[model samples]
Target chain A: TEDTVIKVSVLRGPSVIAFADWLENPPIIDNKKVQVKVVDSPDLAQALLIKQETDIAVLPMINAANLYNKGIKIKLAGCPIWGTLYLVEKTPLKEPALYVFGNGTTPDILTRYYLGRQRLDYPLNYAFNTAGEITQGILAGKVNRAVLGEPFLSIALRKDSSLRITADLNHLTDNDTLGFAQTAVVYTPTMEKYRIAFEDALRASCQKAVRYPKETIHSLEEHGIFAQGALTPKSIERCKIYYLSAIEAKDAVMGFLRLIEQYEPKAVGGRLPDAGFIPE
Target chain B: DTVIKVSVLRGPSVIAFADWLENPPIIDNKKVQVKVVDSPDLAQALLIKQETDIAVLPMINAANLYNKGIKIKLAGCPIWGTLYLVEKTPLKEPALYVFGNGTTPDILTRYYLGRQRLDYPLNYAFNTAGEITQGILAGKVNRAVLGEPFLSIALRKDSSLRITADLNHLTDNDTLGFAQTAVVYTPTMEKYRIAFEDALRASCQKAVRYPKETIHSLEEHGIFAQGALTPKSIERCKIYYLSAIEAKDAVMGFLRLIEQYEPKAVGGRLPDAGFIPEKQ
Candidate 1:
């Protein structure tokens, strides 16, 4: 049976950040309710994906490829968010005490890869399961250094004035090009039936987030992407938000997955995803 | 009972008339025929030759003639500004590639540049949005100003293209982004005034009300290249109507803005009140 509610699941990072306004007030799709909600864990994300309620899922590009390899019916639509990872540290920082999240997946893996690429090293601590937990750790001063994505990266900075951005991870990894493909929206085959409507709505949302970050941050409050009443425009630019559809994303998506597979083979379904991953 | 030939320019203006062009509305026992022309030159030629009773034109083209004592009067405005600046990256010296040299996009940008009191070098290497869209797709042009279908087309094809600015943001959001594309009538149209205006208004309302349906019909008419438009892209087209009486203040104000920039552009001075005729 066709679900009456169109559910799109995303994380706290650029996927949701780039879609801040649309998630605030999603439009009616062919008389059905379209909902874009934030998911905190891989379990919740997987549960919704298999439950058949999810029409589009914004996930770590690696996880998106993994799900498809495991026979999930979702297909790569595009990567709306290019990258958001940044190495952050509380002002008085050290290499030995470090924090990271997502374990084998993005933010965690992307940070590690970028660190090695830059000849930087830290005895890592995967002390949290989600970015928010790490954000709490950093704000509470229990964690001095970590890698985080936006608006989590931006939010934590707001919480602690002493925190400073250590390095932009995207730059070192890609070597002068745009960063790795970090987050993507994978759509169920069913979405193809109304492809134009869904893509246009979602792409417009991403554009609004990128082109007008100052206006977009205020609306992302329900997602708790900010601190108190300070209206300072947050980190969407650093978030690296964009709207890149299927064809345009093929090279970027393939290259990112290949890198993921090299270091942690299982993370990218043991190999680079084929062209079917990003259907034209 | 004459079949009033209503000439409409391509792009947003053509998209607005999509519905009536298919199932043309009948008013006071008289019917209307909509002819979609490719350029401002064609629209102006048809208007000057009196080959069409009602012509939809960019304001500057209409203003130039109206001020030079063409007996044509304003009917209404259907399409506001569909103008925007898009970029992939910057030139070494930072040059903007404008979509069309002498058309609406070019003039609006010139006005925008003057208002901001900034002079960035402009590159007008293409004659039309279509040619510019082709140039962009071929990687010949990296940054440009584009309108509606072509703008949507370029972005959809090339994911890196971002809308850097909406030329409309210069004024009150509710009003015309320059009263851009309008419905104007020759003296011969006076007899069919009530009927023609009635049908034209109905057409504009239908398009604004049902963009998807209108988009499909537009594709069928081959006025829009198939898949070059999205229903949401229609919003950027700004296909709403304001009757001559309702549009006077905006139309006069728009004409004055252009007149200030280049006198002959709006035919040396402002149009008289009779320009936007009122039935009362």
Candidate 2:
């Protein structure tokens, strides 16, 4: 085994299990010749990777493609999870409006493109709160209705069922069939230097994480984000599914990239990103 | 003298039923006075308590109650064909069948599939209109089941979106009679039951013959879609009656369908003796 260690940048979300399972289990990678330190959140992860601070970074859907376009030496192997964007209203807005929230989040840019293709001419709004806050704002009647992506959508709906959904972003985008989609994990040139060993170790650790869910939860607990009980098991399975589906969701990602290129070029490196990653 | 009350949830279904009853006038005011109660769950609880004469509800929930030997009769139907299996994908691999349900489509979806008795694995994923659509579009899921304005919005936004499965079509195939919504009565309250039956029957008949007028009322209530209400759509809303025995069979079929197509986190078995069918 070669003696080497690498730091992996984190993204703004808790979405890194896709490519660094080795961090969850050490023995799996003890023989493979690499170690991983994860930075948290898509934004930070991308920043570190862009600056060559980490061998890997987990970026959001649109950002991942944007990094690729920036000539970043990186590739996406898989996704760690799948979630949605919500078209929420405070008091059931009566009509589909011609305006959207585009805060550089993946869903918003994609949402803008979707509206554009529908021949829908809506003013785009850029509310900086994450999807959750946006959703909460809509519910509390603080923010004029906005789009909520992923974890926020679930959290908000549970928070208030009265929050009416005016549109389902994916439904509107029809991104389901496409293969290219945003996922959580990607590797930089540094990781490619030790690709086989890294991937194998990550795979082994992930497999072990399935058996030792509590240990994984303990790990997350160290980070102050562990779910209680066998919910760890739930998260493990959910993470695995996200990885699997995200690998296949590349088409959807590409569609998102296309939309960004068409409507919100800044999200995709100011234009269509390079196809740097190989789909597995 | 006895008085039996019927009720509906706060929606067009109740309003339409109320309009139908008032138009023809309840003639048999001697034995019982039939009045329409417009509380949300009062109708359902009334039957459970053996207090209300008749209640209208989504067919699947009604069936669940009937199976419990609640002495109910499936008076008639108010079917809406808007329920859909809206997916983000082109209906590919790993599609979602079962979900955390809150609305009528979930029940209708299960019932439609249960009748087929197909052994396909029905997976339960989380349900949020946008997130589920994103799951599909983002390649997290291939197919989803959705209804109403969301469905309409989905079709409008995504050109690739194709209706993979329709609830009404499945109902027709399963011989479900496709009674999306219905008026049910508990026969144990005989005097009140008779009064409700007369009022409902008369109203249904009158509504059918004067659908043009009734349609106008629905429009005023913002029930009809934006386009001119087609006679076919009106026919879709036309009411029809069912016997107690038929309701039992239908509910059983519904349970079986839900069990097979969309097994819940808990269970979906019909009760053995829930309904008070029409008193012989």
Candidate 3:
């Protein structure tokens, strides 16, 4: 009668399928049970974590930071993947402010932080949208510029070969001399007790998906929702380049903590005590 | 011996704040009696009778006071969140629709919508006051403005009813902010104001220490845990209070914003401010 379960909230994407398979046959650790729930939006996952409803949540790292301010005792579990955010410029991007787009998340907060931190007075075209809704905004040409994450970023590149990739988020993180743009997988203390088993399952799943890209692409083609030929095999391979291993997760998170501590101390109180990893 | 009555919807934001008060520690080393009355009616009655020193409420009520030129001041707000235009399906664009209950959120929705010359979707959809979460999940209304518990339930219930737009984001753009809840204090004797502010700030700090327990207490009040409540979410918890600068300029900016939004009011402004605090 070992019914103690860990609920992990997830979103819809290639990760969902892989996570499904991972949960169906969770790696046993002293024979513990693992249950997963697909929570969809990163916002929802953060909300769940703040409320302490879900044990683990796969979330966008920025929003996870926002949730921390809301009074949640949580930490990053492990980073699944990372990718670049693009400022797709459909037109000449010399002067920026006259063409602001409506905004809530995305470029509004995260990108704004970038612009503000850089002290870049690039004319901002703020838009109200999640990363997905933002893609729609750019695709419709409703706005000339949008900040986005891949595979949507890649999808935009596919649509208009003329689209200029203005900003590379990876470069921003790489040049953490200024400190910005770090995404990591997060877990709560309640889930931390089982971090080893969870980390094993996630790392293994991520490896299986990456090692056999063709299988992931095929499964995506078959069972995926909204993949819709948007992400090409090449793009899938591109994603792999950004994927982080457990060790990499630790380094990136630690780097992020250092970066934030140096430039944005309030965000991490100058440093994350640990890289949020406790080896079993 | 004073009761700091506050009104809050049956939701986590309020419940958590209340939980913060239950175990409030000594503030400024001044220990005074603390009691929280859970009933909204009692909180409202206390405010009307000037019996309650503090009241946490949705912004519309404050807007109404601003419209009436009432002599009230926003002491500080502790929680602020976006209101979503929850829908069963994505609309071609924003349009009028029925609202769930005739609560503050719904009324504010009507007020904000009216500003843009949109029709009141349907005749107020006068229905019994069931929770907005149940309404959306049960498919009662394809549209409603929701926050916290109800908002979480709707997201949990239906994957389709996309959050069409975030009202707060929209308001920020339109200069008609979508404020969820606030903690306002009417000026009392000078000695009392200092004591109250100290208590409020102290309780806030204490609450920060007991985040996990606080989140659990909110759940006991039927508000679902959002997810890993990390330290990063602290600012969001204080969203109820505008930035210190915003608070400083609020007397004029608030007047202008409220005046334009509610032209019917003689002058969009709070009650006159006049109080003398004998020096500490």
Candidate 4:
């Protein structure tokens, strides 16, 4: 007899959109019922993975890499987020300005790496707030600029027509390419028994979500996945949906991890995970 | 044969004594030579090795050394209220901060944030004070705690950066008091303790009476020639001179807080009564 319910965890952000279809219509994987749990933050998802309580979780790749580095017996199944980060600003450059963000996460790491590559020595002042709070402030004219993730970026852009995406992190790269995994589906060693079945269901779910973007975002909104009154089909479309097998995105994943390491080693649990962490 | 060697850390703790350094007060017809050390740890090491007769170090560090049987005595407190929190934007719920690792700023900040009973989680990253300041300007972190000259320099360079709080008053209401920098000496130099204290007392009075000249003396030493120093920042930097008795009580109060939170923070115990030099 297999486990009764396959517990799945995901962070409360645009990344959760990838699993909207599966969440609405539960998929049975290897004769087990799949249950979805939406967490307020990736750290909560990390706690679940550390305790081996969740069968699968969608979280920042650095989190999974950190767990794996600490001998946590976790493997990345697939990466669902390549890049969905942007610097939303109301006006053009006027001397050095302050840019707000949710510090110590993907936003902080990617912003540093992106700026370093741009070779722009712009004097930046920083403020700390969640993406949702920052978007709300921007809408209320309380905040001028911030590093925000997608859906929030689109929402801010729509709420105020003057708002512009100052820096598109997704397209800023050495090759001007877009292939750095920000969030991924990771599973504990115990879930290895259902690897093939779980991955098959995950791929199918991702494909369906991409095929019907409107319906996917609609379901996500119904579940209150996005911040209040901040979700729309247009915003969802702007929030890029990317899913690549761990093997295919291995270099990209490591590239991003190395970037984080270059700035903050403790953010990724001190070092990068080895090749064994990538799932076939 | 009469050279009196003193070690001071590479910050305002040393800058506060610039007047005495520029115009050494003769004691027993001996010349004073100031040796600038990189960190509090290095200062302590030099004192332990008997390489320096006098050292300017953090109060807690002196207490830790005294507890560990270093036979050091505090002569006077020359600096206070040097730690300040700068935010690029005003704080909101779920804000993140970048702080120096294992320093007084980190500990005292956590203490105050906890006392405020803020409902949100306190997120932070660790790095050197200089790196944290750079991180704030690079959009990596929006909030950080910096020491005197750096805090002053950063605020002068970037008007957008706001000083949210001064840690000296973090526990002022409780009357716990705070001391950042103090003069420390080993038993080997006890013979000249009174003479050194008298010189420091004169320097401290001069620092208070002619703050501008104190800063100018530092500039002449090329301490502020690093391109980030501003006379405005130097003017804002607070330096104090406390008697041996006042320094002891103030330092003990701070160490008690450290001991309560993390006992090992002050070398597993507070310093004995003899840690403070006798009143003269």
Docking class of 2: incorrect
lDDT of 3 by residue, A1-280 (tens): 2346667777544345345344335555555566666543555676777777877777655556555545567765556655435466776543354233335433345565567766777665544334545554555455566676556666567666657777654445543432232554567765656777677777677776667656655444332222333456555554442334345455555555554455555444333454334231
For model 3, the superposed segments whose C-alpha errors exceed 4 Å read A1-280, B2-16, B27-41, B60-72, B90-123, B126-131, B170-180, B186-189, B192-195, B198-212, B220-270, B273-280
State residue B117's C-alpha deviation in candidate 4, in Å: 6.1
Tens digits of per-residue lDDT for model 2, B1-280? 3444556644335434635433434435533333444443566677778676667676666765665556675654543344556554445685455453644566656565574453345566765555565555555656666544345445555766655555553322121234456677665544554455556555555555676676566556554445444333334342444434434444444445555554441135644443434436
The residue ranges of model 4 lying beyond 4 angstroms of the native Cα positions read A92-98, A103-105, A140-143, A173-175, B1-280
lDDT of 4 by residue, B1-280 (tens): 5888989888777666777678976778788888788988788888888888889987778878888888788876776656666777544333546465466776777776675454334446646677666666666666667776668666766677776555563332121236656788877678888787677756765665676787777777876665455544543454545656644545676788777777876788888879886655
Candidate 3 lands at a TM-score of 0.43
C-alpha lDDT score of every prediction, in listed order:
0.72, 0.52, 0.51, 0.70
- Cα error, residue A175 of model 3, in Å, equals 15
Q: For model 1, how does the per-residue alpha-carbon lDDT over B1-280 read when each residue is reduced to its tens digit?
A: 3676888886678877787778976655557788888777898888888787788878877877787887788877777647877777543335777866756677778877775565777888787888888888898887778888889989999987777556752331112346766788988677677666666657767776787888889889878778888876886676666666655545666677767667777767887767777667
How accurate locally is residue B214 in candidate 2, as Cα lDDT from 0 to 100?
63
How does model 2 score on DockQ? Answer: 0.01
Docking class of 3: incorrect
Q: TM-score, each model?
A: 0.49, 0.39, 0.43, 0.49
**Residue runs of model 1 more than 4 Å from their true location after superposition:** A1-280, B89-93, B114-118, B172-175
Give the lDDT of residue B263 in candidate 3. Answer: 40
lDDT of 2 by residue, A1-280 (tens): 1245565554423354343344444433433434454433456667777777766555676777777877877787655555445466656554434224445555666576556556766555554334433543454444545666433444455446666567655454444442335564677654555556655555555555666666665554323222112134544543432344334666666665676577667767787655455545
- Which runs in model 2 stand beyond 4 Å of their true positions? A17-27, A30-36, A40-43, A61-66, A89-101, A115-132, A142-145, A164-168, A172-175, A178-180, A193-222, A226-241, A244-250, A274-280, B1-280
